[PDB]
Amino acid sequence: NEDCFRHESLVPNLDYERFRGSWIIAAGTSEALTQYKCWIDRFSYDDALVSKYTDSQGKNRTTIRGRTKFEGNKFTIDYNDKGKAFSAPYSVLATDYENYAIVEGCPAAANGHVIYVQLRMTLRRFHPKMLQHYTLDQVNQNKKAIEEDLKHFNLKYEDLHSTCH
């Protein structure tokens, strides 16, 4: 769906290997996605993806797995029949690779379109003493940068639905 994307990426030459890793989705423009809390995407190896999220009460833990295909900033996810509502074209609009990324995509689950902000999930910064606090602090630590890129796409972090709290 190279036609469903609405913005031009600031990282058209996205380095997949640097983008690879775990990411927690902190907030986005889709009210329908608020149903899946503290969503964590784990991109690994050549084209593997493991996505995990819960119910709004921390329960109903769910995992869906898929295969990715990247073309610069663009990538498709093909989830196993389970998670089909999330299979779709996506595009990394901005990222510093080490801390955050802003992604646009067109999954049916988001009523066809969403722009979300994700922060890197790593044991280097995460000490399970929980997820919500981790996400908030990471957003706060990178607020300046996130706000600036978001601004570039006519959005404000405050205008997004929080999807991990």
Give all domains of the chain, ordered by start, each with its CATH number.
Answer: 1-165 (2.40.128.20)
- Cα separation, 51 vs 66, in Å, equals 8
Which long-range contacts link 129-134 to residues 24+ away (Cβ below 8 Å)? Answer: 131/24, 131/38, 131/164, 132/38, 132/164, 132/165, 134/24
Determine which helix (DSSP H) or strand (DSSP E) holds 151, and give its type and residue range: helix 131-152
Token readout for 79 is 């989830």
4 beta partners: none
Instruction: Give the method used.
Output: X-ray
Residue with tokens 């080490």: 98
Cβ atoms of 121 and 137 within 8 Å: the answer is no
Residue 3's CB is within 10 A of a number of other CB atoms, namely 7
DSSP letter (8 states) at residue 160? S
What's CA 96's distance to the chain center, in Å?
Answer: 14
**Amino acid letter, 10:** L
**Where do we find the tokens 């119910």?**
55
Q: Do residues 94 and 133 make contact, with C-beta atoms less than 8 angstroms apart? A: no
Resolution (A): 1.9
Retrieve residue 22's tokens: 């775990």
